[PDB]
Amino acid sequence: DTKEQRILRYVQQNAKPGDPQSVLEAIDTYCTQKEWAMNVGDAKGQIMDAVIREYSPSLVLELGAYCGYSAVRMARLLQPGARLLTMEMNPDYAAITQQMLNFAGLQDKVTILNGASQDLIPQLKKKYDVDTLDMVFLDHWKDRYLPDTLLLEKCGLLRKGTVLLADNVIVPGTPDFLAYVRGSSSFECTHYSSYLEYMKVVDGLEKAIYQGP
Numbered sequence: 001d002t003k004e005q006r007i008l009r010y011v012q013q014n015a016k017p018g019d020p021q022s023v024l025e026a027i028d029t030y031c032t033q034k035e036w037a038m039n040v041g042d043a044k045g046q047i048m049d050a051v052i053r054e055y056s057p058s059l060v061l062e063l064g065a066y067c068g069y070s071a072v073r074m075a076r077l078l079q080p081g082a083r084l085l086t087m088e089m090n091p092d093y094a095a096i097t098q099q100m101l102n103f104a105g106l107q108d109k110v111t112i113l114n115g116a117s118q119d120l121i122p123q124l125k126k127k128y129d130v131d132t133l134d135m136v137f138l139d140h141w142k143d144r145y146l147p148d149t150l151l152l153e154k155c156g157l158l159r160k161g162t163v164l165l166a167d168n169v170i171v172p173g174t175p176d177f178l179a180y181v182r183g184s185s186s187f188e189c190t191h192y193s194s195y196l197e198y199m200k201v202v203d204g205l206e207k208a209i210y211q212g213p
C-alpha cells in the first residue's frame, strides 16, 4: 500500500464513524507518530477554524484535497445547506478523500471534483451551478496559486468580500502569489504565522480578501 492508504485505514480503525473531530485527531496522531504527510495540520488548522467561524461561508472551493484533511476540517464547521467543492487531480487521492469524507459522515456537504483546477475552474458556473465563491482554500501545487487566483478572477467567481486562504506561504512558499496579492489593491491581506504541520518549523497562512476589480 501507499502512505495515503495507511492514513485512511488508521482513521477507519482509530476514529468513530460520523465524528469529524475524531477523524482529524486520528490523522494528526498518525502523521505525528508514524509517517509525516502534507495535511494542513492542527496548528494551522486552528487558524483555519477561526477564519471559517468568522465568515460562515456558504460555498467554499478547495484546491488540492490530497487525503481530505482540510475538507473534513472545513466541512465540519459549515452550516446546514452550505457546501464545499474540492478539486483533486490525482485519482488515487480523490478516492482516499471520498472515503475519508464518507467515514466522517460529511459526504452530503462536499463534492469531489477529480480533475485539475485549471480545467475545472472554467466549468464551475455552467456545470456546477456556482455564481460566486464565498471562500477559497489554496493548498495545491505552490506555483499554481497565482495562476489559479487570476483565473478565478477572470471567470467572475470572486465577489467583494470573497476570502482566499492560502496554505504554505512560508514553507514551501509561494513567492509570486504572496507578492502579488500583497501589492494589489484588489486584495486586502493578513498574515497568520504558525507552524508547518507536525513540525517545529515556521509556516503561515495568508488571508487575501477580494475587493472587486
Ligand SMILES: CCNc1ncnc2c1ncn2[C@@H]1O[C@H](/C=C/CNC(=O)c2cc(-c3ccc(F)cc3)cc(O)c2O)[C@@H](O)[C@H]1O
Residues within 6 Å of the ligand: 038, 039, 040, 063, 064, 065, 066, 067, 087, 088, 089, 090, 093, 115, 116, 117, 118, 139, 140, 141, 142, 144, 167, 168, 171, 172, 196, 197
Ligand atoms: C495543476 C494545478 N491544479 C491542481 N488541481 C487539482 N489538484 C491538484 C492540483 N495541483 C496539485 N493537486 C493536488 O493537490 C495536492 C498537492 C499539494 C501540494 N502541496 C505541497 O507541495 C505541500 C508541501 C509541503 C512540504 C513542506 C515541507 C517539506 F519539507 C516538504 C513538503 C507542505 C504542505 O502543506 C503542502 O501543501 C495533491 O493531492 C495533488 O494531487
Ligand SMILES: [Cl-]
Residues within 6 Å of the ligand: 040, 041, 042, 043, 044, 196, 197, 198, 199
Ligand atoms: Cl500540527
Ligand SMILES: [Mg+2]
Residues within 6 Å of the ligand: 038, 039, 040, 139, 167, 168
Ligand atoms: Mg499545505
Ligand code: NA
Residues within 6 Å of the ligand: 181, 182, 183, 184, 185, 186, 187, 188, 189
Ligand atoms: Na494588497
